[PDB]
Amino acid sequence: SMSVKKPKRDDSKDLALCSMILTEMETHEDAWPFLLPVNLKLVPGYKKVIKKPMDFSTIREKLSSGQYPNLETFALDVRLVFDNCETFNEDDSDIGRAGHNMRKYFEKKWTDTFK
Asked: What 3-state DSSP class applies to 28?
């Protein structure tokens, strides 16, 4: 509350560390469904169904340009990528499986880096 603060967590490395995690996600072999925005002209259903499209290139641009106020907003967009993927793709598809694998990969890096 006013003039009463919990001790200051060092967030000065968060930008660099989110960038490193993002690099590792970018270079994973199962990243290919997530590298670029889904083409909304060429994928019937995507525009109407997926209210907030997100992909790694868009996260990368937001990160590089100071559009994440803190590391939680960054993790929300990463998770959005996988939530969207589950909404649109069957679990037993190459893309569906890719999404599950990447989410697992991300969450481990997230815990090991920050928790």
From this structure: coil
Provide the b/e sequence for 22-47 (b: ≥16 CB within 10 Å): beebeebebbebbeeebeeeeeeebe
Cα separation of 49 and 88, whole Å?
Answer: 8
Q: Which experiment gave this structure?
A: X-ray
List of domains in the chain? 1-115 (1.20.920.10)
| Through-space distance between the first and last CA atoms of the chain, rounded to whole angstroms | 25
Looking at this protein, which amino acid is placed at residue 65?
S
Are 1 and 73 in contact by the 8 Å Cβ rule? The answer is no
Would you say 106 and 78 are in contact if contact means Cβ atoms under 8 Å apart? yes
The letter for the amino acid at 14 is D
Closest to 59 in 3D by CA, of 87, 82, 90: 82
How many CB atoms are closer than 10 A to CB 11?
10
Cα 99 to Cα 105: distance, rounded to the nearest angstrom: 10
Most distant CA atoms of the chain, gap in Å: 55
